[PDB]
């Protein structure tokens, strides 16, 4: 058993060593597929980041001025590297380096603090007041130098130098100068609606016209448009509140403090607009004019005072600046809060407002009723906002933790730039202002927590989605190859011929599994090494990956085993295998979309498919990679997400279970659906059963004669045509005998012998073999059987010696005995010189000898030979005769022959069948006694060229010498007579033979040989008693019509192949689309009350700064102990889901003394207060840095409050260092015991802060301005008074001191708003009046987004884009598997000679290829129409939109037009169909998928500009492949529609045309050019480099060489061919000339070079030397006319397996140009005059062995060519059929044409052949006419005898011959016959002497020939 696997594996590895290219490709293909990933990985480095310390973010509780400053400066999240001054303990400004700050600092330190300056100013003011009442100088001069250095210092100097440019490039520069002016940051900085496909796309307002023009100027340009779209609602929007109760009115009246404060500046600018003209009037006409005149008069008045030490223009610019400001500020909408009454009405008005983009928010107070006016203690509200302006509500944090602070100022701060945090703060400030009478002014500053230096690997996003698909597409080639190999091996009968030799089924399955597993193991080892050392996966243990890949290889091998039991034709198993393998992977892509509602049970159930479990395992690999973990043998078994029972170990466990199930199911189905050549198939309950899985022509059984094989009432009916092939046999083959099985063609010989084996199931009767019935016990029978099939089936690239060694060892023989057996059986069959020639380079006869040879190796007790010698020369048949007669001791040999002398000699009991049933059977002597026995004399006639002599005088002579004589046959010089055998004169016959011998030339006879009754005459008795269209347009149209009809007639009968190659890919696309529409329905967004305890079990900290105040002390208390941190545990109940726990006393954690030693040892104080922990990445990646033991100082004291959370009082510590340096430890402590990471600190509140406020005190400013108004006569104004009336409340709410900071972590989405809510609860509860318990009161915010049917942009567009990309790659799959199906039929034709036979007819390469291209275009058009119809049906708007449908149609049709002529040249490489199919399909798959993946992933995630430069080039490099063109077209058609949908969502409706020359038009034009160029190229590939002698022979050579004759048709001249790598000419130096009236016969030993001569004569192979002129036109130069003057019948039949005989004749009569009116008669004649009358309407596949030769001969003869080359026309044909063919050929050569006939039956080439030529070793020996040959090379008579009873009885006759005929050699003494070459005087003496002693001896049969041709041929074969 192990030995048998050893042998099969050795054979497989030998055949694999013979072909190394396929091996290398099979080991390299997946590595080749895994190249774009390695290139991208080498393209994207790590790029570790830095600390990223973030600045403050003010809020409307902190006043207005810092609010706007923090809106303007912090609009980008600058990401500094060094800590901001905002994270200092009691400092919150964060703008200390601003130039205004420096100038103000200088102004304060110099001027105001200076006491003398204040005194001087007061003195000047008092003097001015005294002067006004009426209506010092040194001190003022003293402060004049004080002013100087104030300008000189670089603050004021810088202010002037930077205001001097004041602004070219306002968009570029104005914000630059403002940002350097207002704040002073030290240089901080830090699909997709991209223009990639953008370019292709292409109101009264009830407001002042100023703002009409303003909004249009904003709306018109995208640079101003996308910013305005997000900024508009805040400046112009509305706010809507439902309850309308006076309580809500009170809350919102208290909440307009910001908007009233913003309206105050509008009041002031209006006041200046009014009052300015008064200033101008005072400067123009006032007492100032007298003042100036006095100043002008100073040189005459105060010249000394003057010497001691534009107005319009400055007033002008100031007037302009204020007005330009005024026009903008005028139409801000600062009356926002607009009441309503119900939720539904609010939503209706929200729909009304959102279209114009005004809706800001809607505030709903659920607890309120319209008739309410008292605020409850615990008040709640909900801020209903849009969904593109508020973060998602159903989820609280992203599914997978990835490193990164999440600080993008656009896609993460939706709560800030959108306007949720601001409005929440205004409303909560309103509430805390309405409950308590007091205020407690405390502003709130956010602060984002800092971060360590991460690495941010940019590759893991790409490898996240394209890794499983590539790791699955890697193995599609191996899967297709394994399934195709299994099906092809079981289709070519190569598996049944193994089961006959003894091997079981278990061994075959085991070797298939072992070989496939070894190959997959090699490729997998290579793949894991390549991935590891390619740095694609960094941390993952390679051993785990290797084991995972082994598990998947086993699973996919068993899947291949299951798939191989479905199909039965390799042309049908090459497409379905790959498509079904990929179809079992789409469920994984569907499972990626849901990502939820995936119960582990359902995940396992879906994973019950192996390629889905592989996808799951790959997902877990990728997830564990992006965490720095990897699967180090402990990580296995636990998922990286929140809660999954699914894991990695269980993934490959399910894979192994899948492999087991598939293997068991394949094994079960194999024995119930065995296929075509299957044995009697067991019933479906094989496991259930306890048993393991004229009646006188027949001779009676003689005594003894034990039977070996019995057949009883056998019936076999091939269904489609009835007509049972084997009707009712009652045969019984015996033990020690060679039973010859004869019968006419299509009688039931091969079918009966196949039923005798297991190859076919009988449909009735029983077949006992050796006593063991055949359907029940077929294994014991086949342990001792050897068969030789009619069509030789044997491995190609195995040699001869290896064939015999394989088959001899496969039956128990030790290595050594196989050597002896092979040597002996090479000696016995004459194959010694061909020991090492491959079994495909052998000649036909040598293959036939090898088959019968390998049928006898080992000891088989039932040997079944089917045509053992059909195509073997008359000499090599003696070797086979001795071989049979030697192995007849106990074997029940059963030979089915068509040579009657063979069956008479060898057969010991013959049985003739006819029409299925047995006709007669018995010992041949008994048969000849039953039917008419007689004595036949077969006299030939010569020619002078009309056949010499006449049948009149010969007839008269024969009837004169014997009056009863009947003429039996007279076909072409044969003229066989029949004479009576009983009661003859003994003298009349002798006189007749004397008369014939003495006059052998007067009658023209040349030969005559008597014979006792042969078997052939008995068998004949049984059988009887049982013009051209002219060239040009007409002929080309006829050729096109004929070829199209042939293709159609072949297609319509094999409908399964047409479906599985055309319609199935469309079904695959349809299934992909049907899975595309199964997506979860959109559910509405929930309430999501915002509180910090959402995440649960977290760390929070607080830091009490500024501890001297009392209000902050009570604030810290009411935030710490009494009411708790947040809103939970407020003594009344809140969210019963979250309980009210108990607290823990103040506790400080322990620490190692190592830390304490470090902390009292060094002196790193107040900068770097903890060891600056290294965070490098280049050495080891370690995304989160490793940091020493003293990371963040000694741990701060902690406790657990009533709410479950850890409070860390980091009061007197560095905050930023603590969080930065203890983040990684906090993450790592979360990683363990859970294997999924999550941060445990989400924020805290740091009480304390200060904001330096200028001391204006309010009243001083208004008094100062009023004093200037009284003095300057500028006082007075309605609007001026109205604006200046509320000044103190304008300076109150500007800036707020004593603030609160709120540290928040953004990786939890709802952290900032929840902690803002907590802070406002603290400020309310701190501000409360006394005696009122703080616990009762609180606030809570609810965030329910607006109740619209809409998804967020960040999710809906990616879903649709990914879906369309997947659909595109599925379409590429489908349309790449189709065009490879057009090479199956081309190779099927080329491997046969059907293409060459059509070329021998009128068809010329251009017409053939053009017609094939037309048919392929039609079929592809059908498939593309199916795909397009599917897209129309599913309403995929991206492709089937009325603007994008022509693009799709053109794309698909031109891809079909452009890829087919690319597949045509590949039909010249592969020599087996279904291997070209697999290879071409896999190549197309790889090219198209890779090109589309590149144009997709690189475009979406390759920001690097260096990659883009290479990519741009590669587009133009890859334009050459039409697959790339189709991929780009489809992906761009998806992306353009995605972008258009994004645009139309906002309301622009941008429409694009697809045919832009940059979009897809280049692809279309390139496809056209590619199609034309490739068709010309395939035509070129077709046209160019397509993939001392005797005396008579010497005389003919001189005749040809010196002067060539002018009457010959065929004139060979020094023909020669040396086969490549042989070093000995197969055919060398032939010179013959065939006249137009003779049948030149080319006899020859096997492997002498006969078929090669025909091959080079027609034009198949390549001549090596010399011409061969056919009717004038040479071969080497021009072959078209040679083909026009020739008809060829190949040795091996070249027919189409699915066209009847009639349609074959119709095709080949149309091709030769017979007119369409005279084709019925030609077909009828060729059908009637060659047999074929019954089988003229059955497919050429359902033909018998000889009925294919009949068809080939009929094909060769249509069209009347004047030179017909028949290459063995009669091999395996009935005597009657070959008689009719002789009649045809004789008619031919009598009509006036010539035929070159090759045959191995010497009766033939003696009857109808005019001139012979025996060819040995590639050169002639005789080349003479029949008479002259039998004269020069022969003498004497041949007395052949047959004695009856064995070998020791042969002695008396030898003594008789030696005593009578003195000189008489002995030739060919077989087991029972003798053949002496007597040299007597005359034949009458031999006849009389042999007949008179016939009774004394035991002569059964006899024959006295006269130097037959067999003697000549056997002499030649013996010599060489
Ligand atoms: C769709 C057309 C594909 C098709 O019809 O293929 C047919 C069989 O294909 C199948 O059975 C597909 C099986 C689908 C299984 C679903 C998993 C014909 O194959 P066959 O070799 O002629 O039958 C031999 C008997 N086992
Ligand atoms: C890459 C190099 C591909 C070279 C493939 C050449 C080749 O023919 O290999 C053939 C198979 O080659 C392959 O499998 C690789 C496929 C190459 C894709 C072609 C584009 C063997 O087929 P065959 O019919 O047994 O050949 C017998 C006589 N040629
Ligand atoms: C809001 O949507 C919810 C479903 O999530 C529905 O119950 C409710 O009636 C809707 N309210 C309005 C005002 O449309
Ligand atoms: C503290 O721990 C370190 C860690 O190995 C050790 O080497 C050292 O000896 C300990 N004692 C000190 C630093 O005093
Ligand atoms: Mg047969
Ligand atoms: Mg041959």
Residue nearest to atom 5 of ligand 3 (CA): 1084
Same fold, 707-797+840-930 and 1636-1661+1672-1829: yes
Indicate if ligand 3 lies below 6 Å from the C-beta of 347.
Answer: yes
**21 CB near ligand 2 (under 6 Å):** yes
Q: What are the DSSP calls for 1594-1633, one per residue?
A: HHHHHHHHHS--SS-SEEE-SEEE--TTTSS-SEEEE--E
| Ligand 4 and 1031: CB distance under 6 A | no
For residues 380 and 1089, give the distance between their C-alpha atoms in angstroms, rounded to a whole number.
10
Method: cryo-EM
Euclidean distance between CA atoms 452 and 391, whole angstroms? 26
Distances (CA, A) of 59 to 214, 421, 1288, 1826: 28, 8, 21, 122
CA of 862 to the centre of ligand 6 (A): 30
| Residue 1641 marked ligand-binding | no
Tokens (6 digits) for 1826:
């029949």
- Give 1152 Cα–ligand 4 centroid separation in angstroms: 9
On the 0-12 / 13-18 / 19+ scale of CB atoms within 10 A, 837 is middle
Q: What is the DSSP letter of 112?
A: I
Listing DSSP states for 704-721 in one string gives S--EEEEEEEEEE--GGG
Cβ-contact 179, 69 below 8 angstroms: no
| Contacts for 111-119: CB closer than 8 Å, 24+ residues apart | 111/146, 111/150, 114/143, 114/146, 116/142, 116/143, 117/143, 117/146
The residue nearest atom 5 of ligand 4, judged by CA position, is 1154
- DSSP, collapsed to helix, strand or coil, labels residue 1368 as helix
Torsion sign across C-alpha atoms 132, 133, 137, 138? negative
Q: What CA–CA distance (Å, rounded) separates 505 from 782?
A: 12
Q: Which ligand is nearest to the CA of 1798?
A: 6
Instruction: Output the 3-class SS for 210-279.
Output: HHHHHHHHHHHCHHHHHHHHHHHHHHHCEEEECCCCHHHHHHHHCCCHHHHHHHHHHHHHHHHHHHHHHH
Strands 378-384, 1338-1342: parallel, antiparallel or unpaired by DSSP? Answer: parallel
Instruction: Supply the residue whose CA is at minimum distance from atom 10 of ligand 3.
Output: 1347
Domain 707-797+840-930 CATH superfamily: P-loop containing nucleotide triphosphate hydrolases (3.40.50.300)
Contact 1471, 796 (CB under 8 A): no
Token look-up 């159903």 returns 394
Q: Which two tokens stand for residue 1068?
A: 């695959």
793 lines ligand 1 (CB under 6 A): no
Return the residue whose CA atom lies nearest to atom 8 of ligand 3.
1347
> Hey, what are 642's tokens?
């929140």
For the beta carbon of residue 318, count every other beta carbon within 10 angstroms: 13
Ligand nearest the Cα atom of residue 477: 2
| CB contact set of 1532 (below 8 Å; sequence gap of 6+) | 197, 1559, 1560
34-39 long-range contacts, CB within 8 A, separation 24+? 34/470, 34/474, 34/527, 34/530, 34/531, 34/536, 36/1490, 36/1493, 36/1494, 37/463, 37/466, 37/467, 37/470, 37/536, 38/530, 38/534, 38/536
Q: Which ligand is nearest to the CA of 1188?
A: 4
CA distances to 351, 494, 1596, 1598 from 1633, in Å: 101, 44, 8, 12
Which of 624, 473, 164 has its CA nearest to residue 1481? 473
Q: CA–CA separation, 1397 vs 751, rounded Å? A: 30
Ligand found nearest the CA of 1474:
2
Residue nearest to atom 13 of ligand 4 (CA): 1154
Ligand 4 pocket residue status of 1162, Cβ below 6 Å: no
- The answer to whether 467 is annotated as binding is no
If you count DSSP H runs as helices and E runs as strands, how many of each does the chain have, helices first?
77, 44
- Please tell me the distance between residue 848's alpha carbon and the centre of ligand 2 in angstroms: 29
**Residue 1063 CA: which ligand 1 atom is closest?**
1
Indicate the helix (H) or strand (E) that contains 818: helix 815-827
Structure tokens at 1744: 């018998």
DSSP, res 182:
S
| Structure-token pair, residue 365 | 């107070």
Closest ligand 1 atom, residue 1064 Cα: 1
**Does the C-beta of 344 come closer than 6 Å to ligand 3?**
yes
Angstrom CA distances, 780 to 499, 674, 789, 1326, 1746, stand at: 12, 20, 21, 100, 34
Measuring from atom 22 of ligand 2, which residue has the nearest CA?
1470
- The response to whether 1269 counts as a known ligand-binding position is no
Beta-bridged to residue 712, according to DSSP, are 766
* 749 marked as binding residue: yes
Could you say which ligand is closest to the alpha carbon of residue 1482? 2
Please count the other Cβ atoms lying within 10 Å of the Cβ belonging to residue 956.
Answer: 11
* Nearest ligand, CA 565: 1
Rounded to the nearest angstrom, the distance between the alpha carbon of 1165 and the centre of ligand 4 is: 22
Residue 27 near ligand 2, beta carbon < 6 Å: no
216 CB near ligand 3 (under 6 Å): no
Q: Which two tokens stand for residue 1303?
A: 């540290």
Q: And the tokens for 486?
A: 């299994």
Pick the CATH number of 1833-1920 from 3.40.50, 1.10.3470, 3.30.70, 3.30.460: 3.30.70
What residues pair up with 709 in beta bridges, in sequence order? 733, 769
Q: Which residues, by Cβ under 5 Å, contact ligand 6, an ion?
A: 843-844, 1651
User: Angle 1353-1377/1476-1493 helices, nearest 10 degrees?
Assistant: 160
Q: Is residue 1882 within 8 Å of residue 997, measured between CB atoms? A: yes
d(CA 557, CA 1369): 26
Q: How far is the CA of 1478 from the centre of ligand 2 (A)?
A: 11
- Hey, where are the domains in the chain? 1-33+453-542+564-692, 230-363, 707-797+840-930, 934-1012, 1038-1082+1377-1587, 1636-1661+1672-1829, 1833-1920
How far apart, in Å, are the Cα atoms of 329 and each of 206, 870, 1548, 1674? Answer: 16, 109, 29, 102
Contact 1819, 1628 (CB under 8 A): yes
Q: Is 1831 in the pocket of ligand 3 (CB under 6 A)?
A: no
* CATH superfamily, with its number, for domain 1636-1661+1672-1829: P-loop containing nucleotide triphosphate hydrolases (3.40.50.300)
DSSP 1847: G
Long-range contact pairs involving 135-139 (C-beta distance under 8 Å, separation at least 24): 135/287, 137/305
| Chain centre distance of CA 537 | 23
Looking from the CA of 1775 toward its CB, the CA atoms found within 13 Å total: 20
What SS3 string covers 654-677? Answer: HHHHHHHHHHHHHHHHHCCCCCCC
- C-alpha span between 1916 and 1814 (Å, rounded): 8
| Residues making up the chain, counted from first to last | 1920
Ligand 2 atom closest to Cα of 1471? 24
Report which bound ligand comes closest to the CA of 562. 1
| Whole-angstrom distance, CA of residue 565 vs CA of residue 573 | 10
Instruction: Please identify, by atom number, the ligand 2 atom nearest to the C-alpha of residue 1469.
Output: 8
Does the beta carbon of 566 sit less than 6 angstroms from any atom of ligand 1?
yes
22 Cα–ligand 2 center, Å: 7
Asked if residue 1028 has its Cβ within 6 Å of ligand 4, the reply is no
Check pocket membership of 22 for ligand 2, CB cut-off 6 A.
yes
The response to whether 1872 counts as a known ligand-binding position is no
Ligand 3 centre to CA of 1347 (Å) is 6
Ligand at minimal distance from the CA of 1068 is 1
Ligand 4 contact via 1154 beta carbon (within 6 Å):
yes
- Quote the Cα angle for 1086-1089-1093, to 5°: 125
Cα dihedral across residues 581, 583, 588, 589: positive or negative? positive
| 396 CA distance to ligand 1 middle (Å) | 50
Cα 195-201-205 angle, rounded to 5 deg: 95
Q: Which atom of ligand 4 is nearest to the CA of 1158?
A: 13
Instruction: Decide: 730 and 918 in contact? Cβ < 8 Å.
Output: yes
**By the 8 A CB rule, do 616 and 588 touch?**
yes
Give 695: exposed, middle or buried? Use CB within 10 Å, 0-12, 13-18, 19+.
Answer: exposed
| Distance of CA 487 from the midpoint of ligand 4 (Å) | 71
User: Which of 1347, 1348, 1349 has the most ligand 3 atoms within 8 A of CB, as the residue to mutate?
Assistant: 1347
Cβ pair 1366, 406 in contact under 8 A = no
Closest ligand to C-alpha of residue 1479 is: 2
What is the distance between the alpha carbons of residues 979 and 985, in angstroms, rounded to a whole number? 12
Q: What is the resolution of this structure in A?
A: 3.3
- Going by the DSSP 8-state scheme, the letter that residue 1757 receives in this structure is T
SS3 of the chain: helix, strand, coil, percent, to 5: 50, 10, 40
Task: For residue 1115, give every residue at least 6 positions away whose Cβ sits within 8 Å of its Cβ, in sequence order, or none.
Answer: 442, 1247, 1322, 1323, 1326
* CA gap 525, 631 in Å, rounded: 19
CA-closest residue to ligand 4 atom 2:
1154
Question: Is 1652 annotated among the ligand-binding residues?
Answer: yes
3-class DSSP assignment, residue 613: helix
Side-chain half-sphere exposure of 32, counting CA atoms within 13 A: 13
Element holding 978 (H helix, E strand): strand 976-979
**Counting Cβ atoms within 10 Å, is residue 1847 exposed (0-12), middle (13-18) or buried (19+)?**
exposed
Instruction: Quote the CA–CA distance of 1144 and 1132 in Å, as a whole number.
Output: 22
Pair 153, 161: CB distance under 8 Å: no
Is the separation of the CB atoms in 1614 and 1666 below 8 Å? yes
- For ligand 2, whether the C-beta of 642 sits within 6 Å is no
Mutate to test the pocket of ligand 2, among 16, 19, 22 (most ligand atoms within 8 A of CB): 22
Given a contact cutoff of 8 angstroms between Cβ atoms, the answer to whether 651 and 732 are in contact is: no
The total of other beta-carbon atoms located within 10 Å of residue 1423's CB is 23
Cα 465 to the chain's mean position, in Å? 15
The fold adopted by the segment(s) 934-1012 is Alpha-Beta Plaits (3.30.70)
1647 annotated ligand binder: yes
Instruction: Looking at the CA of residue 1152, tell me the nearest atom of ligand 4.
Output: 1
Terminal CA-to-CA distance of the chain, rounded, Å? 45
Ligand 6 centre from 1644 Cα, in Å? 9
Atom of ligand 3 at shortest range from CA of 346: 13
What separation in Å is there between the alpha carbon of 1154 and the centre of ligand 4?
A: 6
Is 1651 known as a binding-site position? yes
State the closest ligand 3 atom to the C-alpha of 1084, by its place in the atom list counted from 1.
Answer: 5
Residue 1428 — φ and ψ, nearest 5°? -65, -40
Q: How far is the CA of 1692 from the centre of ligand 5 (A)?
A: 15
């Amino acid at each position: 058993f192990v030995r048998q696997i050893q042998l099969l594996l050795w054979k497989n590895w030998t055949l694999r060593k013979r072909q190394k290219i396929r091996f290398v490709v099979e080991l390299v293909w997946p590595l080749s597929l895994f190249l774009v990933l390695i290139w991208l990985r080498n393209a994207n480095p790590l790029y570790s980041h830095h600390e990223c310390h973030f600045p403050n973010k003010a809020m409307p509780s902190a006043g207005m001025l810092p609010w706007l400053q923090g809106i303007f400066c912090n609009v980008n999240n600058p990401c500094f590297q060094s800590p901001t001054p905002g994270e200092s303990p009691g400092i919150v400004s964060n703008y200390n380096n601003s130039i205004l700050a420096r100038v103000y600092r200088d102004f304060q330190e110099l001027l105001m603090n200076a006491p003398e300056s204040q005194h001087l100013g007061r003195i000047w003011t008092e003097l001015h007041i005294l002067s006004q009442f009426m209506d010092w100088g040194g001190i003022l001069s003293d402060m004049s130098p004080r002013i100087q250095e104030f300008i000189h210092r670089p603050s004021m100097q810088d202010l002037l130098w930077v205001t001097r440019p004041l602004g070219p490039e306002t968009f570029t520069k104005l914000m630059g100068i403002l940002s350097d002016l207002l704040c002073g940051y030290p240089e901080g900085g830090g699909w997709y609606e991209d223009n990639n496909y953008k370019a292709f796309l292409g109101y009264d307002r009830r407001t002042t016209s100023f703002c009409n023009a303003l909004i249009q100027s904003l709306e018109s340009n995208p640079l101003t448009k996308i910013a305005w779209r997000a900024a508009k609602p805040l400046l112009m929007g509305k706010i809507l509140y439902t309850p309308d109760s006076p309580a809500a009115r009170r809350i919102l009246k208290n909440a307009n403090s910001t908007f009233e404060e913003l309206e105050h500046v509008r009041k002031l600018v209006k006041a200046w607009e009014e009052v300015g003209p008064q200033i101008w009037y005072f400067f123009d006409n006032s007492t100032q004019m007298n003042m100036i005149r006095d100043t002008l008069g100073n040189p005459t008045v105060k010249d000394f005072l003057n010497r001691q030490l534009d107005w319009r223009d400055i007033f002008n610019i100031t007037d302009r600046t204020l007005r330009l400001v005024n026009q903008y500020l005028e139409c801000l909408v600062l009356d926002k809060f607009e009441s309503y009454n119900d939720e539904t009405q609010l939503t209706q008005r929200a729909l009304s407002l959102l279209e114009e983009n005004m809706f800001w928010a809607g505030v709903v107070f659920p607890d309120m009723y319209p008739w309410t006016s008292s605020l409850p203690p615990h008040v709640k509200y909900k801020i209903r906002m849009d969904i593109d302006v508020v973060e998602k509500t159903n989820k609280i944090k992203d599914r997978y933790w990835d490193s990164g602070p999440r600080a993008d100022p656009v896609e993460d701060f939706r709560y800030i730039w959108g306007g949720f945090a601001y409005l929440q703060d205004m409303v909560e400030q309103g509430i805390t202002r309405s409950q308590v009478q007091a205020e407690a002014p405390v502003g709130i500053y956010l602060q984002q927590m800092p971060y360590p230096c991460f690495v941010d690997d940019s590759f893991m996003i790409i490898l996240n989605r394209c890794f499983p698909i590539f790791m699955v597409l890697a193995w599609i080639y191996s899967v297709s190859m394994t399934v195709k190999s299994i099906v092809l091996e079981k289709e070519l009968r190569l598996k049944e011929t193994l089961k006959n030799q003894g091997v079981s089924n278990a061994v075959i399955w085991c070797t298939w599994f072992l070989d496939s597993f070894s190959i997959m193991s090699m490729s997998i080892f290579l793949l894991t090494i390549f991935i590891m050392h390619g740095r694609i996966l960094h941390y993952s243990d390679p051993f785990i990956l290797f084991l995972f890949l082994l598990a998947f290889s086993t699973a996919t091998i068993m899947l291949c085993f299951l798939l191989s039991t479905f199909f039965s034709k390799a042309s049908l198993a090459a497409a379905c295998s790959g498509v079904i393998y990929f179809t079992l992977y789409l469920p994984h892509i569907l499972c990626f979309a849901w990502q939820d509602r995936m119960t582990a049970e359902l995940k396992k159930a879906v994973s019950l498919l192996s390629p889905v479990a592989f996808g799951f395992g790959t997902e877990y690999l990728v997830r564990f990679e992006e965490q720095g973990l990897g699967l180090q043998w402990s990580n296995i078994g636990n998922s990286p997400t929140e809660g999954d029972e699914f894991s990695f170990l269980l993934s490959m466990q399910m894979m192994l279970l899948d492999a087991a199930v598939y293997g068991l199911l394949a094994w079960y189905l194999d024995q119930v659906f065995p296929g075509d050549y299957g044995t009697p198939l067991p019933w479906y309950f094989l496991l259930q059963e306890s048993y393991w899985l004229h009646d006188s022509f027949f001779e009676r059984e003689h005594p003894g004669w034990v039977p070996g094989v019995c057949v009883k009432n056998l019936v076999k009916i091939f269904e489609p045509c009835g007509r049972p092939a084997v009707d009712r046999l009652n045969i019984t083959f015996y033990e020690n005998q060679i039973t010859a099985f004869l019968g006419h063609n299509g009688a039931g010989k091969t079918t009966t012998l196949s039923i005798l084996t297991g190859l076919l199931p009988p449909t009735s009767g029983t077949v006992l073999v050796g006593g063991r019935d055949i359907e029940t016990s077929l294994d014991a029978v086949r342990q001792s059987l050897g068969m030789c099939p009619q069509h030789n089936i044997l491995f190609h690239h195995l040699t001869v010696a290896e064939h015999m060694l394989f088959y001899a060892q496969l039956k128990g023989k030790s290595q050594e005995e196989a050597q002896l057996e092979m040597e002996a059986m090479l000696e016995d069959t004459g194959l010694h010189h061909k020991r090492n020639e491959e079994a495909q380079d052998l000649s036909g006869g040598m293959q036939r000898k090898l088959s019968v040879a390998i049928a006898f190796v080992g000891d088989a007790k039932v040997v079944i030979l089917d045509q053992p010698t059909s195509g073997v020369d008359p000499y090599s048949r003696r070797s086979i005769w001795d071989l049979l007669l030697k192995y007849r001791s106990g074997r029940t040999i059963i030979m089915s022959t068509h040579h009657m002398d063979e069956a008479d000699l060898l057969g010991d009991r013959i049985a003739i069948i006819a029409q299925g049933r047995l006709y007669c059977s018995g010992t041949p002597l008994f048969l000849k006694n039953c039917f008419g026995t007689g004595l036949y004399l077969t006299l030939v006639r010569k020619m002078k060229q009309v056949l010499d002599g006449d049948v009149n005088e010969l007839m008269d002579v024969v009837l004169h010498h014997v009056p009863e004589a009947k003429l039996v046959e007279c076909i072409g010089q044969e003229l066989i007579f029949l004479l009576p055998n009983k009661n003859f004169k003994h003298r009349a016959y002798a006189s007749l033979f004397r008369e014939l011998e003495e006059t052998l030339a007067d009658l023209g006879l040349s030969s005559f040989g008597i014979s006792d009754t042969p078997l052939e005459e008995i068998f004949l008795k049984v059988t009887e008693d049982s013009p051209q269209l002219n060239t040009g347009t007409q002929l080309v149209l006829q050729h096109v019509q004929a070829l199209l009809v042939k293709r159609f007639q072949h297609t319509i009968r094999s409908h399964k192949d047409f479906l599985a190659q055309i319609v199935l890919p469309a079904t695959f696309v349809f299934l992909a689309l049907m899975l595309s529409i199964v997506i979860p329905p959109f559910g509405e967004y929930p309430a999501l009350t915002l509180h910090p305890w959402i995440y649960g079990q977290q760390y929070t900290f607080f830091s009490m700064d500024e501890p001297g105040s009392e209000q902050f002390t009570v604030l810290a208390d009411v935030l710490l102990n009494k009411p708790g941190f947040g809103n939970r545990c407020l003594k009344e109940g809140w969210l019963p889901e979250y309980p009210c726990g108990n607290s823990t006393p103040w506790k400080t954690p322990s620490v190692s003394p190592n830390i304490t030693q470090l902390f009292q040892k060094q002196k790193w104080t107040q900068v770097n207060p903890s060891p600056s922990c290294r965070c490098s990445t280049r050495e080891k990646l370690t995304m989160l840095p490793e940091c020493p033991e003293g990371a963040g100082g000694l741990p701060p004291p902690q406790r657990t409050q009533r709410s479950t959370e850890i409070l860390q009082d980091l009061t007197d510590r560095n905050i930023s260092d603590f969080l930065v340096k203890t983040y990684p430890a906090l993450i790592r402590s979360s990683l363990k015991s859970k294997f999924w990471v999550n941060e445990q600190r989400y924020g805290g509140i740091s009480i304390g802060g200060k904001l330096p406020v200028v001391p204006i005190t309010g009243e001083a400013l208004v008094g100062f301005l009023s004093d200037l108004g009284r003095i300057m006569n500028v006082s007075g104004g309605p609007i001026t008074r109205e604006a200046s009336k509320e000044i103190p409340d304008f300076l109150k709410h500007l800036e707020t001191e004593d603030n609160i900071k709120v540290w928040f972590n953004n990786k939890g989405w709802h952290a900032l708003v929840s902690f803002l809510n907590v802070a406002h609860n603290a400020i309310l509860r701190a501000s409360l009046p006394k005696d009122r318990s703080p616990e009762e009161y609180g606030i809570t915010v609810i965030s329910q987004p607006l109740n619209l049917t809409k998804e967020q942009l960040s999710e809906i567009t990616v879903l649709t884009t990914s879906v369309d990309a997947v659909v595109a790659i599925c379409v590429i799959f489908s349309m790449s598997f189709v065009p490879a199906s057009f090479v199956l039929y081309l190779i099927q034709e080329r491997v046969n000679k059907s293409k060459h036979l059509q070329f021998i007819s009128g068809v010329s390469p251009t017409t053939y290829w053009v017609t094939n291209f037309l048919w392929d275009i039609m079929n592809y058009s059908v498939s593309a129409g199916l795909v397009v119809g599917i897209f129309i049906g599913f309403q995929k708007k991206a492709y089937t939109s009325p603007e994008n449908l022509p693009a799709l149609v053109a794309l698909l049709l031109l891809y079909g037009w452009a890829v087919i002529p690319m597949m045509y040249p590949a039909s010249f490489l592969f020599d087996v169909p279904s291997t070209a199919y697999v290879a071409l399909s896999c190549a197309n798959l790889f090219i198209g998928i890779n090109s589309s993946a590149i144009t997709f992933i690189l475009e979406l995630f390759e920001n690097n500009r260096t990659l883009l430069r290479f990519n741009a080039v590669l587009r133009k490099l890859l334009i050459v492949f039409p697959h790339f063109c189709l991929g780009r077209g489809l992906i761009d058609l998806a992306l353009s529609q995605a972008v258009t949908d994004v645009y139309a969502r906002f309301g622009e409706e941008h429409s694009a045309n697809p045919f832009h020359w940059d979009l897809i038009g280049k692809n279309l034009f390139a496809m056209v050019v590619e199609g034309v160029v490739y068709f010309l190229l395939t035509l070129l590939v077709q046209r160019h480099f397509f993939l001392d002698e005797d005396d008579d022979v010497a005389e003919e050579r001189q005749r040809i060489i010196t002067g060539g004759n002018k009457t010959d048709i065929l004139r060979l001249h020094e023909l020669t061919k040396i086969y490549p790598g042989t070093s000995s000419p197969a055919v060398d130096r032939l010179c013959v000339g065939v006249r137009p009236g003779e049948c030149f016969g080319l006899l020859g030993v096997n492997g002498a070079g006969k078929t090669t001569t025909f091959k080079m004569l027609t034009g198949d192979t390549t001549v090596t030397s010399g011409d061969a002129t056919v009717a004038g036109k040479s071969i080497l130069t021009n072959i078209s006319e040679v083909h026009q003057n020739m008809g060829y019948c190949p040795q091996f039949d070249a027919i189409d397996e699915l066209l009847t005989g009639r349609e074959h004749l119709y095709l080949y009569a149309r091709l030769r140009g017979v007119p369409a009116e005279e084709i019925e008669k030609v077909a009828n004649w060729s059908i009637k005059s060659l047999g074929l009358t019954v089988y003229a309407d059955c497919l050429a596949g359902t033909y018998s062995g000889g009925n294919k030769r009949k068809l080939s001969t009929a094909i060769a003869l249509i069209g009347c060519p004047p030179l017909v080359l028949l290459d063995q026309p009669t091999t395996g044909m009935d005597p009657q059929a070959r008689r009719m063919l002789w009649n045809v050929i004789v008619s031919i050569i009598r009509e006036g044409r010539a035929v070159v006939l090759t045959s191995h039956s010497m009766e033939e080439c003696e009857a109808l052949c005019t001139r012979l030529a025996i060819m040995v070793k590639g050169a002639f020996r005789c080349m003479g006419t029949i008479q002259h040959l039998k004269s020069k090379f022969g003498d004497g008579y041949i007395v052949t005898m047959k004695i009856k009873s064995l070998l020791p009885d042969l002695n008396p006759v030898e003594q008789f011959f030696q005593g009578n005929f003195p000189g008489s050699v002995q030739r060919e003494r077989h087991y029972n016959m003798l053949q002496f070459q007597v040299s007597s005087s005359s034949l009458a003496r031999i006849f009389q002497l042999l007949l008179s002693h016939k009774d004394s001896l035991l002569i059964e049969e006899y024959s006295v020939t006269q130097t037959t041709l067999d003697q000549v041929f056997v002499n030649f074969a013996k010599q060489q």
